[PDB]
Structures are given as C-alpha cells and as structure tokens.
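Dear colleague,

Following up on Tuesday's group meeting, I ran the structure prediction for the nine-component complex that the binding team flagged. I've pasted the input sequences exactly as they went in, so you can double-check that nothing got truncated or mislabelled along the way. The structure tokens for the whole assembly follow below. Feel free to forward this to whoever is handling the docking comparison.

Inputs:
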Amino acid sequence: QCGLPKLMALELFKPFVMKRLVDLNHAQNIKSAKRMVERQRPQVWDVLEEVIAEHPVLLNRAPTLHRLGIQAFEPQLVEGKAIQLHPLVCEAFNADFDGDQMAVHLPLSAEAQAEARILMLSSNNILSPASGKPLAMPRLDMVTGLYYLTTLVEGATGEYQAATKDAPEQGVYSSPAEAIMAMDRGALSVRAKIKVRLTELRPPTDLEAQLFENGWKPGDAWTAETTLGRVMFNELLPKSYPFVNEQMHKKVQARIINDLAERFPMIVVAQTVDKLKDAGFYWATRSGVTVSMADVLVPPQKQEILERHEAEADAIERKYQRGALNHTERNESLVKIWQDATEEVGKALEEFYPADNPIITIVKSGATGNLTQTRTLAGMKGLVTNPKGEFIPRPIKSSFREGLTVLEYFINTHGARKGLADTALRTADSGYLTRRLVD
Amino acid sequence: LTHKRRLSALGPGGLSRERAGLEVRDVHPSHYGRMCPIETPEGPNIGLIGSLSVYARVNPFGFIETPYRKVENGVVTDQIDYLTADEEDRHVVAQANSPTDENGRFTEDRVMVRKKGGEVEFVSADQVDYMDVSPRQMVSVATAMIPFLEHDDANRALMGANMQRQAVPLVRSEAPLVGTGMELRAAIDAGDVVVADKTGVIEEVSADYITVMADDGTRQSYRLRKFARSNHGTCANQRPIVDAGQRVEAGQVIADGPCTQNGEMALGKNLLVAIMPWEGHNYEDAIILSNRLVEEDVLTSIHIEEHEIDARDTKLGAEEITRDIPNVSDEVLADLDERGIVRIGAEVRDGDILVGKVTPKGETE
Amino acid sequence: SAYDTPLGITNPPIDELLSRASSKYALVIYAAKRARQINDYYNEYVGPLVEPGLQEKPLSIALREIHGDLLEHTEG
Amino acid sequence: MLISQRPTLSEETVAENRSRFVIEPLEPGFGYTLGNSLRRTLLSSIPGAAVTSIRIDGVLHEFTTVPGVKEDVTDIILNLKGLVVSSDDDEPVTMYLRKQGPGVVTAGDIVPPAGVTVHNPDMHIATLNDKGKLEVELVVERGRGYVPAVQNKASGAEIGRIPVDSIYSPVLKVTYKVEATRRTDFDKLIIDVETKNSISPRDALASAGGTLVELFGL
Amino acid sequence: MLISQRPTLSEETVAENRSRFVIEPLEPGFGYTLGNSLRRTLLSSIPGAAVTSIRIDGVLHEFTTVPGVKEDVTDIILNLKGLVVSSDDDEPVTMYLRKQGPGVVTAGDIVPPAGVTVHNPDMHIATLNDKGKLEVELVVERGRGYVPAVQNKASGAEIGRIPVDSIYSPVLKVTYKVEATRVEQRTDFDKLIIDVETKNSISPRDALASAGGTLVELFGLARELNADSEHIE
Amino acid sequence: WLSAASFQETTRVLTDAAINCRSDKLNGLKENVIIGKLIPAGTGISRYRNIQVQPTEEARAAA
Amino acid sequence: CYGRSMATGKLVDIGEAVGIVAAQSIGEPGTQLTMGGLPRVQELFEARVPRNKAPIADVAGRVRLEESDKFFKITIVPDDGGEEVVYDKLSKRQRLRVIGVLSDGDHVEVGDQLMEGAADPHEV
Amino acid sequence: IVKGENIPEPGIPESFKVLLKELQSLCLNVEVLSSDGAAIEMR
Amino acid sequence: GRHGNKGVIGKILPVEDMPFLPDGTPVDIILNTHGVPRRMNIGQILETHLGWVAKAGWNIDVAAGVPDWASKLPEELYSAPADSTVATPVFDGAQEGELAGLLGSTLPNRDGEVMVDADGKSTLFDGRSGEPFPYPVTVGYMYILK
C-alpha cells in the first residue's frame, strides 16, 4: 500500500469518478460531473474510494538506477498533500525523507494494470535482482528495535534462578501468556533468561528430533530456555518455522529472511516482514536509545597515548631537524606514527564503552553507523588529506566531541570538500557508464 | 545579506561552469579570513561560489584584504593593518586565541604560527609579527551564526549555512534561545530593520509609521513596510518595538523586520525536543510535531502572490476589462465589482475569477 | 499453507496463480484478456464464472477465476 | 487474595486555577493507565467558549493596519487568541469593543452580553494613540477542542468577516503520578489539573468523568 | 454541550476461548486513551479463583524429583498453574489429590470441597509410573490479577510448602491496536481492536461486561463531583 | 541504424546509414519504443501476447 | 545457461530481459565506487589498453630474471625447449607479480602475468 | 473511460512522425516499408 | 536546524498523546536518534542541552567558592534567570566541562522539582498508553527553521 493525497488522487482519477458519479444519479450529464469534481462537492469523495479500490498505481523516484526504482502499490486516500511511503521500500528507492519527492503514474489498460499487480507489485519484489539478497529487510530502527527485543541480559528481573533446596526452579512459566502477565507487573523483563513451555511454536530442528521424532507439535507442548522477547520474536515468523533463539544482528536477520524466500511463498515473506516492522518500531522506541553529551565519552588513555607519540614525533622531528633524516621519510614516519596511534585510541575507546551504551548499540546491531565514524566523534578524527591528495602529517588530535580548533577545522575542510565534490561527478560518470551498458 | 557578499567565478571574463577543473574548487591557504571555505553550493557549483568573510575587505585594485594586529617583540599592539594575500605570506601570523599577559605580552612559552606554505610551526613568541584579529576570521556571516560550529563536520555545516538562507519569516518571529554573536549585528546590516540615525525621542508610534524628535530639533520619520510581497513571496512585514515616550540613541532599532526580534536575526523558533525514536513515525530523517505548533501559529508564515493581466489593442478591436463574461453564471461573478476585478477582501479558490477580460473574436462559424 | 488472510491486491497470492500459467508474463496476458472479455459482457461475452464481489473490478474478477481453474488457455 | 475498600476520590487545593485529585486504593499497575485516560480526555474534550470570528469597521481583511493603532490587524488577532471566555448560552453571541483616544485596550474593555464573562480582563490587546480608534465586535460560540478558522466562503459570512482559529479548552496543563507498594501492595494515583479560570479543576474533572463514564458501555 | 455519532461495539469469535472486539467509530483520538485502560481492567480487575500454594508428599528438602512419575516437580507445578476452578469461599480452601494407580492423573481426580468447582477436568497433571502413588494438597484463595509466588516468611515455617505463581484472572492474554475509518463523513476516526483469550471460567463477552462495569463505576468517583458537563449517548 | 542514431554520434551514423542504404527490421526493443511498438521482451513476446483465453465448457455450464 | 533469477529465486522466466537487468545491476552500485574504481571498470568494458600495461607469459617454461637498474629483463626458457622469449624493458616502478614475488627459476604457464598491473585484454 | 468501454489500441507517436519529417528535411529519404507492401504513408 | 539536520514533517500528533515531561508539558518535536551519530553533527545535541539551560535558568554553587569547571574564565555567568538568552561565539563559545556543570541547575517548573538531570535526560510519559518510557530520554530546546 501507499498513502495518496486525496486531492492528487481526485485529479488522477478525474475521468473515472466522472463516470461513476454519472452512473449514480449524483450528476445528470457529463458536464455536471466535470464541474462537480472541479469544485470538489463533498459527494465525490465517497465515489473516489470506489474507483480507487484495488486499482494500482506506479511510484517512481529519480534517479531510477535499477528496475526496483518503480513499484506498484494499492492507493489509500490520505489526509494532507504529502505521500505516505512504506518504510521497507526506502532501500530500493534510496529514498530519504529529507524532502525527497516521488512521481505517481496511473496504469489505465487492463494489460497495464495486470503488469502492475503481477510484475511490479511491491511485495512480489523483495530480493534485489542483482545479488539475490533481501532488500525490504528491516533497517535502522527495526534493527535496533529487534536487536533489543532478542538480546539476553544477565541478571535481569525475574531471571530463572535454577532454585535449590527450598524453592522450586522459580524461572518457569505456564505459558507465554503468563510471562506477559508477569512482564506487565514488575516481575518479568523482556530480556530475561527464563524458560517457558510453548504449545504454538516450533522448536529447533535438532531438539525437535530428540523431543518428539514422531512428528512435530502444533499443540504438543515443549519447553526451552529463551528470553521472553525471543518468544515474541518467533511469533512473528511463520508457525511452521523453527525456533531461532538468538539476538538478531542485521546479518542474522538477513540469513532468516533470505531463508524464508527459499522455503516459503512470496506472500509469506511479504507478511512476515510486515510483522517485523511493527514489532521493530514498537521496541525501537522502548529501546531507550537516545543521544547525549554524557552518552558520548572519551577514553582517559587518550592523553597519554597522544603525548607519547608526540615525543616520538618530536624525536623524529629532532632527527629530521638534525639534518640526517630524509624529508620524504620524515613525513612518512609521522604518517605511520599517527596512523596506528589512531587505532590505539580506537582500541581503548571500544574497551571503555559499556556494551549497552546507546551509541554503540546502533553500530553493533548493524542498523547504521561505523566504528571509524564513532572514532572521530569521540577520541580523535585522525589524519586528513591535503588538496594534492597527500597525507598532511599534521594530525587532528581533537575529536568532534571536544570540538576542533581554528586550524584543525580549516584543515579538515581541505579534504571534506574534495570528498563531497567527488560524489558530484561520481553520479554523472556512473550514469554515463550505465547508459553504455544498457545500450 | 548573503546574496550581496557572494563571490562568483562564473560569467563573462571568468571560467565557465562546465569547463573549469577541480583544482580551483579546492580550498587554498590564502582563503583564510578572506573567503569562507565552509559556505558554498552543494551541487555542481562547489568551490566556484563563496561568500566574503566577516572581516574581509576589498582593495581598490581588486584583491581581498584581511585585518591583522601586528605583534612586535612578543607584544601585540593595538595597530591593526589590513594585508593582502601577497604581503601576508611575507610575515608570520600568530593565532587569534593565545594566552594574554596583563598589559599585553606573549605568555605561552610558544605561539601558534602560520607560514607561507602555509605551514604551522612554533617559536618562543620572539619572531612573530602579526596576529589574528579574532577567531572566525575565515568564517562568513551565515557560517558564524551556527552555534557550536567547531563541533560539526564541514559537510553538515556547509548544509547548515546554505539552509539559513532558505528559511521563511514567521508571523511571531521569535529569536534564537542559544545563539552566537552575529545575530544582532547581521540583522541591522541587512537593511530589513528600522534603525534611527539621530538621538532623540519618539513623537508617535503607529503601525503605519514611527516619528522621532531628535535633540537637534530636527524630525525624522520612518514609514513601515506592511505585508509587502518579497521577491520570492515571503512576507516583508515590519513591527515597531518602541513606545511613545521612549528615549532612543543614534543607531538603535526602532522596529523589527521579517525575521528579526529586538534587533537580532530570528530565522526560526525554539522548540522542546525529544531525541527518542517514536513508533516508526520519525524515521529516516522524518519529524513529528506537537499539534500545538498549529493551534498557536508558532510555525505559521504568510505568503503573497502577484497576478497580472493586461488589456491590449488587438488587430480585430480592443481588449476590454469588464464584468460581462460570454458564458458564465451570475454566481461566478458574485465577488467581482463593476469593472470586473475581484473585490478587495474576498476569498479566491482554484479556478476563480480575478480580473474579467474579453477579446474580439473572428468569423465564429 | 497458512500464510494469512491477504488484503485486496495481494489476493490471490501470486504463488497460487503462477502454477496456473507458464510464467509471470503469461499470467499477465491471461488475466488481462479475460478482464477485457468480462467488461464487454457488461456492455467476447462470457462470465463472470465466479460470484462477483460487490463492486469488484473485472481484472480482479479474472484473477479469482484463474485461481479456481475456471478457465484454460493456450500460448501462441 | 481479594481486598475490597472501594476507591476513594478526595479533592485538594494548590492554587485557585488548579487543584490536585487523589484516588485510592487501586490494584497494582493501574494509576498510569487510569491517569493518562483522564489526561487524554481533559486536554481535548472539555467543552468551553471561544471567539469564532471578529469584525472591525475600517478593515475588510486581516492583513491591513488601523490608523493610530500600534499593532497591525494580524498581530492584534494573535493577542486576542489569548482571550479566555466562558459562555453560559448556546447560539453564537456577539460581544462589542469600542475605544477612543490614547491608552491601552485590554480584554476588560470588551462589553460582555448576557451571561458571558471575560475571565482575564488584564490582557493586552492593542495600544492606541491620540488618533487611534478601535471598533470591533467578537462572536463567541460554544464547543470543544480546536477548530481551525471557518472561512466565510464556506459559511454564509460576508467580505468583512474575519474568521479566527478557535480554541475551546478550559483545561491548561495536566500531569499525574502514582504511589506503588510492596501485607499486599496496591497503587494510589494523584493527578494535578489546571484550568484557564473559565472552570475549576473540579468541574473539569467532572466533565471528563461524565464524558468518560458515558463512553464505556457493555 | 456534547453530541456525537456514533460508537458501536462488535465482536468476532475466533474460538470458544478467544474473541475479537471492535468499536466504531471513536472520536480522535479516544481509541488510544481507553484502549490501554481496557487491557488493564480485563487483565487485573476481574475477580477469580486460582491456586496459591501446593505441598506434595515426599518432597520436603528434595530439590526437584518425584520417583514413580515421569513429570518432574517443575513440570507439575506449571502443569497445575493451568488449573481453572471457581471458588466461592473467599478464603483459602485446601483441596486434595491422592492417587496411587499407575495411570494418567487429571483434574477430575481431585475432590473439590463444597464451594469450589474445577472447570477443566480433562487437564493432565502427572503420569504415574508403574506402581507409584501421588499425594498433593492444593490451596485455593479468591483473588484478582496476577500475583507472583509469595514467600511471606511464613512459607519458611512450612516444610515442603511450595508457593506457586497464581493466575487469578480468567483472561490469560489480551492485546489491542487502533486503525482509521470514516471514508468521508468523518476523516481519520479511530477504530479500536481488542483481542481477548479467556479461560473456560468466563466467556469473552462476560469478561467484557465485567470490565465495562468495573471501569464505568470507577470513573463515577469524578462524575459525582459535579455531573454538570456531559457528552452524548 | 535508428538505434545507433539515438545512442551517440547521430550525424556520423545517419550519413553512413544513408550511403549504405541500410534497412532496419525493427527487431530490437529500443527501435520499438521509438515508433511506439511493443518491445520484443516480457509480455511483448509473441507466445505471450498471442495467448487465447476462454472459459472451460465445464465452467460455462456452472454459469 | 543463464540460471536462477535473483529476484524470483527460481529458473529465469522465458520473457526476462537479462541484458538491461545486468547493466542496471552493474551500474547502480557505481555510485559506491571510489572514482581502482569507475575509471578501472570503464577501462575494462571499453576494452582499452590498460593504463600501465603488464606483460603476460607467451609460452610455458622457466624464467630467467635480470636487473638492468631502471629496468627489468625477464626471459622465458621454453620447455620445448625452443626459441627463448624476452621481455625487454620493464620499469621497476611496476613491480613483479606474486605467486611470493616472482623470482629467478620459477616456472610459468602460458597465460600467467609477469608484473603487477593490468594485462592487455587484446593480448590475452 | 467516460463510457466504461475498453481502452482502445495505441496509435503512432506524433513525435516519431515528426522525426521522419525532420530526417526528410536533411535530404534523407526515410521510407516506412511493409513486410511486402513496400511503402507506407503517414497521413 | 542550523547544523545541517533537515527533514520533512512525518506526522503531527495531538498534544494529548505525545512524550510529555513529568510536568505534563508535551514536547513539540521528536527527532530520531539514529540520524544523529553517523552524520558528525553533534552540535545539535549541545544546543539541545544549552537550550534547556537558558530556558529554566541556573545558579552556580556559591558554596565556599567557584567549582573547578568554572575556573577557566566564565565571568558573571554564574546566575541567569529563566528564559535568558545565550550566545556562544563559534570558536570561542562554551566548552564541554562548563556544560555539565550547568546541566544541574535551578529547578522550578512551578513546584520545586527538577525536570532534567545532569545528563540532559528526563523520564517522558507516553501520551497514548500513559506509561513512562523505560529509559531516560534526552529533552531540551532546539532552534529549528521553516
């Protein structure tokens, strides 16, 4: 589906609604029908929903790189003048919501509508037609939302205690519906390591062999030890799918969704990814993932590491100032001294950040971000290239958390501009190549 | 204010847009304090268009000069000398911020310096000649208005500067809660604010004009722009910020412009922000707002269009502006006056008539 | 197979429809020509072989007909 | 483990415009869902009175000025949005305001018709000078929530009518909090209701309840 | 004052245990307001009886085992948590289950004292291995909501007394979500969807009316203040 | 030849095509796009576009 | 011959136009190629002589390496053994390929690359 | 669409008809040929 | 905002159901957390903290002397009333240490309860379910342009 502005839809379907409201006694002749739409008399809207029903439309965003840049959707009248786009098709369209626009086209002929519903329909195109990998796979929020759901926290609330001598196990629940009643109360945590008896879910392949080996269990009850979230997670996958019981990194989700496309019809994957979306968003907000000057911290070893290599460069700078050192080798020495010195700050930085820090969770889960990016935020941005392409031996000791200096900032733009300028001519040339491949 | 102060490499007598190589687009060491390196187009015009720096100055010969405070024997004097790029490399430029010693002397053991490379090196403060007038010499007016500029990468900053120009004046025009130094200085130098040129007292204050009775006995008056359609449709309305009996001083702010409040640039509003992801509605740079921002008209703005029609002499007669239309209902003309032009204060809907006109017809058949 | 209830355009599933034709392309013309056939009846002349929905579109009808194997075709 | 001491709702007082409300006891995990169920209803559905349209003699629309007045017509309407009025009658009623000579017009200067009151006459509208004359009437209607200004081309108004955004919201700011327990442990919530002085926190919370009671059905 | 048109409550039966309920149409955004409040009233506000503590003969200091049966102590505790019995005592009543026959034990084998009635006799409790006996006591006290197992420092005095997690309410799972409706007349009105999986003690419809009455009466504490302002029926 | 013309070096292509007196069969898919024909791919292929459809005699009976 | 359709996961349908799908599958990521990038790719599809031409073995046999400073001499002694094959002037800037790095005495097959760089496609 | 009939079959793009005309203006004789019915006229 | 952060208005919620502080004060905008870290524009977070400082006011501890973080030439900035405006020149503006020291500062809403901790976070209540969000969320005032 897609959200279509009611005003836009009315004009697109103008000739259609004109006939419908003339078939009905709303208007007596086609002349009255036309004016009845132009001035937008309230009767047309009820008529518009009918003509638009199950009538597909094509949605394109330029530049169109691969055929997935155009996909059919079922229109839905929406309040406002903007277009509502499904969050899972952004990957294909490369669509950012920073102000991008999209074109709508109305297939008319029976063959054209058939092609839209069959060939170009949104849910039928999931894997990229180049690598076979999944594209509509959850991303960026749905990732951290699920990653948080499936993760297992040691010492959580209500954790299965493996009780001894005076108390039964204490970590068992009659059903998953009980773990919910226990989660709503302060008893249970969604990230606990409790064990539950499940009647409506399927166990892994290995354990299923040892547990039944006579068949499977649609109602036959079994028990495994998983986080309450991992249970709810598997409730999103098809009932016929084995229980996974892992914390979902993005690659792990790619493995699973990639597997559904081999073992299940398309409509099954279309609906499974829909359920992953709703679940991912709900837990993305409950994830408690924000940003603050506090959640951004620096490793205390940065001072010693920095001042240490400083003297190592001063000594080499003293060796070059002594006249014996080779000028090309001096800078190359400094470049090598500072290059791996950045890795140390990166190593010390990762060691410092607790695993549950909101900044690293975003990068860990594979939702978005790199470590090299988080190395410039806190710690040190590192060396920067000169305009001629050479590596300026003067490093950026400061990080964007502590703020750069007048000279540090002026030097960074030297390279930052060349990169942004490259992206300009990298699309004009890449497009000139694709036109020759196509031809 | 940035359109003027804009510097272009295009046009006759200079390299054209498509042919120029990337070597010119790159920043140069001599751009410091003369042409802001952070403010430039994102598109195909990168590096070919830039804005003059804050303290920069143009020479009678066409070369940009930058203000410096010369230092002699580790002491920064009050002598300020504008130097061209050529003579700048001749000397050594100390850094704007360096520890100051009580009456003026280099306190730090060594001082930051800039060479003709340019190169960055040190001395014990004895061999320095000139120092920077202040930080943000390299920065432009728009760039200098970004709080915490030093913290943001040049990429996102460049976007930040280009987007200030694209703001639109609101109805309330609230000033920034956390700003920089340029807010008030840039508004008055823009010209969209009303400044008093003689010390005196206010005689009258009306939405129409503001009169001041100077100590000189002379009398100045200022007619206020009211809901003037800007070049791009934005509202150029002005509002008075002074009362009747108020005293005023030469160069003060009498009324606010479109995007100004109390003399300083107010390009937006201050809003209560929450940085949590929320139910997949603010996702992939999308945003969600409180409906309060609609009921209270905090982000409301006025826009004005100009429609035009003429009645010329046709080979088959003369065009006539009239209320009579060949085939129309008496209702479609309900908002037209005698002449056939829409009546002031009426509402107009897509397709409505603004000015009735008719032209002669030939050989109908 | 329990996929779920499909909504509108997604019904019937393509998988169950592709077993009725050689390819996705043949499926297109298959349902396309039958759809233009139905609309003529409301003005070839046959069908709707299935119980039409309230305001169902003819193209949507022809898809349901192909799902139930109510018609056969021969490729050129 | 049945425990039955029927819920008790006792009032309080903090200021004249706002007053706390407390209800105890309640089963564990109830105050939050019950508190927000009132807050959501208070901030929206509390009926009230608000000014729909306004008519000023000299001006035919909203984007002009008035001779002698310091505020333009559009900035005057912005101020008038802050008027908190209460109309005890249905059926739109027109107020009236007329001021001459210097001074400062305020909400108190508006003459209210039968059974209507301006609850913040201290509000500033426009500052007039010797040449300034302001003659404006205001139509007060009754409703709830926020209704965007109804354009006169949609209504039956004439070119002189100035429709304005109407906000019928007696309630101003609301919050709540709960005291849990850990004898069995129950939950007790206390809510803080604040009004614009057109109604008291008591009558407002009664409106929500009465409006909330009628909705639950079975 | 207030008049609106027009809310309606409907119910779709998914099974004898579950039923879906929808209210159409609501005023924006009343769906979210009352939605979360209903899930709480149905979940923790309906009175019901359930097991509180159990003591099994032969298990005093043993950790987890029961010679003579293939079901462990843990598997039987959660096997008993599913017992559904309506007790009219209002006070803790101790039922008893004693079987030595090498056969399957069910909820029907227990003798409920006068006032308590088991609603799921077919429920499996334990499988008795050849030549084994099973003796167990059960404590049943009326309650509401979900009360986790409680050791009140008096559970330590009892030797072999096992406090268990008590599911007092008949509804064992409930959820809700909202949608939009109203093609033209209303625009983006709210539709409330609520999912209730109930125990055999009470049908979904009775659990609703019980939640409706308990919720309506609760808001009377405020309406009684004035009753002046009102709304539509 | 009209495919090579629309691609690049139009003048060069047209002059050599006119001298060689070339004839374009209009088989490629870009040629058909230009003249408004059905491209020879996908649903445009002969086997697909010539599909004949009719309801089964057993279905017409059920009516 | 073509094989499975990446989008369908099944054998490609008979109507599929794999030509365009290939051009788009290759070009679309071009925006992500540091342009060892677009210039190198275009160099390959356009079949132009490589930027820095590297020689390939012309026949099988052992190699005799010789260093004339500022150059390199590589001679292949055929296993025939027939006429020796010499590669006259090899700029040392373009160092030798790796197996480690090619050394005197190593065996070479008919198509191996003698030095780091891009082999002339027309030559191969 | 207004009559609810089936959408008809497409014709010849006017732009293409203009192309043949612009090619004829260069002294290029562009003839649209049938399979066997040699020459066709666009009118 | 002034930091290159741009985005369209995805949705506008009724003031009723919106993350609102313990005061009952609904937040006006909700910005996504993920687009912030990777883009390298962290100034928008800084001015989000300072924006709250300038809104509620602050008073540095006169207790026994000036803390160590205010030792490096903040002058007469020790106290500021509520809603007072601030100016941080680009390269001479406030510094990280001085921020934290100000994060904990004067605490009226009307009652004497703080609404934001020294980390720039607060416990927001979901306006739909009516229950607090599990973790502390960063709130503040940011300057955004139309």
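The longest helix of chain G spans residues 18-27.

Cheers,
M.
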